[PDB]
Amino acid sequence: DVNKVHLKLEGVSSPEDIKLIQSRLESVEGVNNVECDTAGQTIIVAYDPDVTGPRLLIQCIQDAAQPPKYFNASLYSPPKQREAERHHEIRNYRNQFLWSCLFSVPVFMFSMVLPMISPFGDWLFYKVCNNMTIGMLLRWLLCSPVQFIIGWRFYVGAYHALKRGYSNMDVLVALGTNAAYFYSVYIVLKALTSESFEGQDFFETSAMLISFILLGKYLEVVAKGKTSDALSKLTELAPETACLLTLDKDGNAISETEISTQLLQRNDVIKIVPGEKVPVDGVVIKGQSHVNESMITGEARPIAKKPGDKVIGGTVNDNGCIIVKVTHVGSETALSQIVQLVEAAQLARAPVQKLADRISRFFVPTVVVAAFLTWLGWFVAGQFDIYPREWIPKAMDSFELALQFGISVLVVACPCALGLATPTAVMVATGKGASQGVLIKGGNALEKAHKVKAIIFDKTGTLTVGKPSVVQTKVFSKIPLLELCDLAAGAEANSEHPLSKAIVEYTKKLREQYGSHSDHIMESKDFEVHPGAGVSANVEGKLVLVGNKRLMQEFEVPISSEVEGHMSETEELARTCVLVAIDRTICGALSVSDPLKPEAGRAISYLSSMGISSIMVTGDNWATAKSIAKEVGIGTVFAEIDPVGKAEKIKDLQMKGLTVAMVGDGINDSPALAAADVGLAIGAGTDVAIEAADIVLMRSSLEDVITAIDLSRKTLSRIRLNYVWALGYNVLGMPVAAGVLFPFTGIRLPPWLAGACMAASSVSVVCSSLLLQL
Ligand code: ALF
Ligand SMILES: [Mg+2]
């Protein structure tokens, strides 16, 4: 923008408006260079970064606004060309497959079944000049558009494999189809020029092969995955617009405009309404407020902001107005950095080498060195006359018999349903797995998740629940435990703090313990709360003081061994988890803790059992991290980590060889979620976390990570199969094709009983869905 703002003109279709805009911009000095893209109805404005800005230039653009339209100008980007392109590619591959069918299914409805049945068999076998029957001409005409139009893909793929590669799937399809087709043409032309030469055409296999490979290509796209990721959600985290200030301070007087955030630049001033998305990162000038910063820490403690510190963009304040001088803009904001990190991570995810290419790398050489040896068989057996003369068919020479057997090897050896081995599972895991509670956003995720050997874990939200709860509780003030929490909640009426919610929830749990929620409370009379202190109120004529040492010594409540028994470890010091909660008098304490990890303990234990290690890269306090990791069983406890560092840890563990996996919930995890080989997002986390992962965990349960890994292992089993079941049918038809049986049984190649191995091959590729082991 500030370097090169792209101004795609809106409502402009005539070059005269573009020229007027160009003249107005040339009348303005400060622009380093204007790249005049007259063809395209856009103008490029190149100038120095970190100076002035769009505003005046955009106003100059607007000044030419005359009928019939208003002359807006801004870089336009494809809004949903991703989903449109996904749908169009799926539809295009489907259309190619169906078009291939609507000529191949003809060839196979013809000379596979209809010749067997009359009267159609009579018409097909009704002869034309010499022995060429009209069936052969019809099939030659019908299969030709397939092989020579629909199959340009295969020919160009083979020619691009050439020598730069060794042999891909395309060359294998090329050999199969072309050998069958040209041998069929040979057969037909010879039957035309001969008088007794019989022999069916192999036109069926050539056309029918194209259908299956296209089916594989179609299933490739469908099973590739949902429309990429949609980074955009990060950009939506920042507000699209804000309010300029220019108010009070000497010259700054009144100017409460509503300029969009993009046009806001360096050395600007903004207003920040109480409770709204902070436009960009900056340094506050005046005002006291707390900000729900979840872009670095990822935790929901309202952090203090006094005039002088730096506020991070894409954040939400609560306590009043905050007046900010604008720091780094554009590509230097925290959200910006997140965007580049996630884009780089996603754009560097190289696709896995399909084993079909690996198989075809060796298999294609094998077929050629097998057909040639088959030819180097029967042929040399003809020169020395080992095989009896009567074996040769009518009107054929020893060379032709060798060719019949040699070309037969090529046709049968083609594996047909090899493309339908990875995508033919349509990733059934994307399926049964969804029922289990795992939604795989692709197939690459499933492919890479089996080899996971290490897995990182966010604490807040992922390992721990995240919303504080009062769990490890005790007694205290000189009123009953039930009355303790009753008066506490009474004080918590006007209070709407996270710890207030936790106190209310613990109160509900004890009301369950103490029968039910008999009667109720009254409002926070004399809402006396002091800074830091806690929650104080005169509820029911009782001046309660739920809080810390300041509020205890406010009424002079002695500090004793329970302010030394309920934090630090988690329950070893000040009398709740890390904090307040003692009410009025002391006999014990509470524990406003993050509600542990219902099953994550056994989850981590099971993960360690299968050899997968475990890491905890959080962003919260070292002290909190210590206790949680100690209790669950995690090893290394790298904490106080920013999103960039979270990505760095993943990259480091990748460098040492292990294939790692990120499990996260927040926007913090996104750089690490994308960077990891297979990112797992908790379905109760931020929407952009769901966005950036490869696997999303709907049912919030860390045990679903175990389920995902198991479902990824059980789909590499049964993907090594369905390669075995794909190749094997052709491999154990190659000897039959070569004619090994022929000396010992006298049975030649059946045009049907060995050309329709793809029916056996494809149908043999079935995938089972019976999983989950907790
Ligand atoms: F939820 Al975290 F570091 F524990 F982002
Ligand atoms: Mg989290």
Author numbering: 184 to 957
The authors write:
To further dissect the transport and regulation mechanisms of P1B-1-ATPases, we focused on a member from rice (Oryza sativa), OsHMA4, or simply HMA49. This protein is localized to the tonoplasts of roots, and is involved in root-to-shoot translocation and grain accumulation of copper. HMA4 has three predicted N-terminal ferredoxin-like MBDs, although the one closest in sequence to the M-domain and the P-type ATPase core, MBD−1, lacks the metal-binding CXXC-motif.
The protein was produced and purified from Saccharomyces cerevisiae, frozen on grids in the presence of detergent and with one of the established state stabilizing phosphate mimics BeF3- or AlF4- that inhibit protein function. These have previously been used to trap the outward-open E2P conformation, and an outward-facing (E2.Pi) transition state of dephosphorylation, respectively. We also studied the effect of no such supplementation to HMA4, which has previously yielded an early E1 state of AfCopA26. These various conditions yielded four structures, determined at overall resolutions of 3.3 (HMA4BeF), 3.2 (HMA4AlF), 3.6 (HMA4apo), and 3.7 Å (HMA4Cu). However, in HMA4BeF/HMA4AlF the M3 transmembrane segment is partly covering the MB’ platform, and the two cysteines of the invariant CPC-motif of M4 are further away from the intracellular surface than in HMA4apo/HMA4Cu, indicative of an architecture less compatible with receiving metal. Collectively, these observations suggest the HMA4BeF/HMA4AlF structures represent early E2 conformations linked to copper release, likely E2P, while the HMA4apo/HMA4Cu rather represent early E1 states associated with copper uptake. In HMA4BeF/HMA4AlF an outward-open, water-accessible conduit reaches the CPC motif cysteines. From there and to the extracellular side, the pathway is lined by residues of MA, M2 and M6: including M941, M391, M292, E387, M295, D384 and M319, of which M295, E387, M391, and M941 are highly conserved.
